[PDB]
Short mmCIF file of C-alpha atoms in Angstrom, two decimals:
data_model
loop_
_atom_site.label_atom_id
_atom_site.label_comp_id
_atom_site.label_asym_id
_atom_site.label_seq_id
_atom_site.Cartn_x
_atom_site.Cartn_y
_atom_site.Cartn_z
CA UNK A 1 6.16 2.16 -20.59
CA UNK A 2 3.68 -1.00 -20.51
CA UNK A 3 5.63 -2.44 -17.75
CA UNK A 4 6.36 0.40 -15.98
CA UNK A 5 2.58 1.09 -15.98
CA UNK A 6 1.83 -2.56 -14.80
CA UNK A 7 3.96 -2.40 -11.82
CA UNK A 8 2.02 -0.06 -10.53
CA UNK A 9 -1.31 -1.46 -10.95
CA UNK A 10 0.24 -4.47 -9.30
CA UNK A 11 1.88 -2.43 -6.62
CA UNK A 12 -1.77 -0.48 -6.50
CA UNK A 13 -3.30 -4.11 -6.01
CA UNK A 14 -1.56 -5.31 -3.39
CA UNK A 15 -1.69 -2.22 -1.35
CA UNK A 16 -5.72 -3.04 -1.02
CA UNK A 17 -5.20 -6.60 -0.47
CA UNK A 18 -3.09 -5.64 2.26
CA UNK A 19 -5.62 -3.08 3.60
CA UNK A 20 -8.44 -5.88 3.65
CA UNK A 21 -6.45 -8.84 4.97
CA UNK A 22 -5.87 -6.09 8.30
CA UNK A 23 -9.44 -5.76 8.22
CA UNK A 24 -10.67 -9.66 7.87
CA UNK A 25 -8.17 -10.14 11.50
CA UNK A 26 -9.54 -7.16 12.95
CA UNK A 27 -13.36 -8.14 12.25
CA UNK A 28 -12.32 -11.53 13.20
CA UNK A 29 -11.03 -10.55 16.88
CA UNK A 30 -14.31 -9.19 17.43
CA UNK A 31 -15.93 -12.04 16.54
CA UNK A 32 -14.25 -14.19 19.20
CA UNK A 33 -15.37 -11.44 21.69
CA UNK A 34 -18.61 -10.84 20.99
CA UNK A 35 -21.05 -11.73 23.83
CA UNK A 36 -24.32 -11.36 21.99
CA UNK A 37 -25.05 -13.81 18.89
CA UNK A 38 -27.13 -11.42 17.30
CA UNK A 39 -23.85 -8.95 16.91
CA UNK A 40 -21.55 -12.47 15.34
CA UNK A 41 -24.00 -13.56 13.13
CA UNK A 42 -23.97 -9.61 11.41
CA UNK A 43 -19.89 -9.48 11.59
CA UNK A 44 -20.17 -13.16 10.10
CA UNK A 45 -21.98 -11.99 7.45
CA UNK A 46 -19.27 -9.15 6.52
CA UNK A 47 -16.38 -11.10 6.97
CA UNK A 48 -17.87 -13.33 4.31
CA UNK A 49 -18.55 -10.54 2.33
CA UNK A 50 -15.14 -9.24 2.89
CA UNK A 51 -13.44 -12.98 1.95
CA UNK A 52 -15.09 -13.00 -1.36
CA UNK A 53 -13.78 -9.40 -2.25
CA UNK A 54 -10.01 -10.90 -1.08
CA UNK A 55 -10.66 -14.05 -3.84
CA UNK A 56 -11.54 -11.35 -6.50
CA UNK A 57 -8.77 -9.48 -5.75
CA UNK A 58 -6.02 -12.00 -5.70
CA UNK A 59 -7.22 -12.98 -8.88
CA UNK A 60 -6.59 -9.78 -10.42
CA UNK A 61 -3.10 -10.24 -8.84
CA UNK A 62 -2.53 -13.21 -10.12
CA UNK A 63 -3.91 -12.31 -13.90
CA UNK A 64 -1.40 -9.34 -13.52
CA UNK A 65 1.39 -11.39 -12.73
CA UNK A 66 0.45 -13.66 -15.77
CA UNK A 67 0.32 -10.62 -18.12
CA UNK A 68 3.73 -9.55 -16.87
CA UNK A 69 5.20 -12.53 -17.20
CA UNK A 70 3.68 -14.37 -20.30
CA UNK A 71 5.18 -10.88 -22.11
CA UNK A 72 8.87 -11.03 -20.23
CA UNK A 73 8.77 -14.22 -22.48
CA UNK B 1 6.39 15.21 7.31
CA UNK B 2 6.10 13.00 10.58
CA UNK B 3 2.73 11.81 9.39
CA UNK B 4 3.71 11.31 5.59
CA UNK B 5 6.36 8.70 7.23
CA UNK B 6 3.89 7.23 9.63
CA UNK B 7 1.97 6.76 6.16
CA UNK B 8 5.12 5.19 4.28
CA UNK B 9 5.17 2.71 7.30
CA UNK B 10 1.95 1.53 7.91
CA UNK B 11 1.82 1.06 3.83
CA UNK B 12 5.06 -0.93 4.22
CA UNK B 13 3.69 -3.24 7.38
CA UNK B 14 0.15 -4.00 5.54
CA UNK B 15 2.15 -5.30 2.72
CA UNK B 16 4.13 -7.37 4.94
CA UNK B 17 0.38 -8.50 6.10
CA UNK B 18 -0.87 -8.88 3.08
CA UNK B 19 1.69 -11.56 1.71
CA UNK B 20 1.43 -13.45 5.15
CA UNK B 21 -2.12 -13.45 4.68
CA UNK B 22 -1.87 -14.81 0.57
CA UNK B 23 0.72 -17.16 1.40
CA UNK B 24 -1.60 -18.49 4.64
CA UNK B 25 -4.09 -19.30 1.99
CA UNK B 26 -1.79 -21.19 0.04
CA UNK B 27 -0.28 -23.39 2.71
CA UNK B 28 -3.44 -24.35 3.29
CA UNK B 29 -4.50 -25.51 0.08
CA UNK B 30 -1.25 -26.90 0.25
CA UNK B 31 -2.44 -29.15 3.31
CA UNK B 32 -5.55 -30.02 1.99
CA UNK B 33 -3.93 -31.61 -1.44
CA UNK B 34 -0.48 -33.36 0.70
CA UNK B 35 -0.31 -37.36 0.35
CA UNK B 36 1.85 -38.34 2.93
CA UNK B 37 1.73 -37.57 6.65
CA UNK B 38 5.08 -36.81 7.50
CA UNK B 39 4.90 -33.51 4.55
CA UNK B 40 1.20 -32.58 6.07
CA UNK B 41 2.91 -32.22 9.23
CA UNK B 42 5.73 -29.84 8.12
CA UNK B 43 3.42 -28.19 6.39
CA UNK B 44 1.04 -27.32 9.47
CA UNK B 45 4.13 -26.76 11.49
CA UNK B 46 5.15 -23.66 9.06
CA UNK B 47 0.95 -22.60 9.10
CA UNK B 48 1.49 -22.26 13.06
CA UNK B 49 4.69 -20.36 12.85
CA UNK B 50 3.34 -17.75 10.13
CA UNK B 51 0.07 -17.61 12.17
CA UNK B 52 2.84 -16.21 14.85
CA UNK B 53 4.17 -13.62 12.75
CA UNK B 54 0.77 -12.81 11.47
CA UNK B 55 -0.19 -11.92 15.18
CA UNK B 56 3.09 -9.78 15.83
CA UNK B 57 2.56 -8.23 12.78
CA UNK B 58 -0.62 -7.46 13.25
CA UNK B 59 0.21 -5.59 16.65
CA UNK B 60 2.99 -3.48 14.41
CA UNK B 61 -0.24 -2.24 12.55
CA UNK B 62 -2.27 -1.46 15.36
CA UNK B 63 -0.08 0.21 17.57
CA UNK B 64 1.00 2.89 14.12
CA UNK B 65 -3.01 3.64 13.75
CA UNK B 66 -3.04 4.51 17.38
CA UNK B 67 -0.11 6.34 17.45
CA UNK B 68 -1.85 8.35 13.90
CA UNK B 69 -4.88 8.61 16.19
CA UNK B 70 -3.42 10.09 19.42
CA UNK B 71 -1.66 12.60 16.69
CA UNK B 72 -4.76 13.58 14.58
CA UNK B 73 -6.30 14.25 17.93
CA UNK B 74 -4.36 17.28 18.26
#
């Protein structure tokens, strides 16, 4: 019931990190291409942006993982 | 039906993408922390090969949204 319910909000968890690690190689291919600097410096920015939302959400991974298993115990 | 399955496997390749990408992380950290030479190179070996799958995989994912696209636009 607790670890059923878990599961998913791991399962839930990754599903997002999955969705924004597409997007950081997607923003970073048009990086490469961009001709004007103007245009890199603004998808810079948001893949910076995006990064820091990827550390906070592999934290909540891994504190999910902890929970699950430091109860497994 | 045919687009609750495309669904299913696009879910099912940006998990695949999303461990690559975690365990990318890691290996490099990894690297960063190795002593000896001879285990950072092994180590950057492996980085380069997953960077490989990374890029196949990530043509998997793109070629599924287009094929969702050219459907939707219909």
């Amino acid at each position: 019931g607790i670890n059923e319910e878990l599961s998913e909000v791991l399962q839930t968890l990754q599903d997002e990190f999955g969705q924004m690690s597409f997007d950081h190689q997607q923003l970073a291919k048009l990086i490469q291409e961009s001709p004007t600097v103007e245009l890199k410096d603004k998808l810079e920015c948001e893949l910076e942006a995006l990064v820091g939302r990827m550390e906070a959400k592999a934290n909540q991974i891994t504190k999910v993982r902890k929970y699950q298993a430091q109860l497994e115990k």
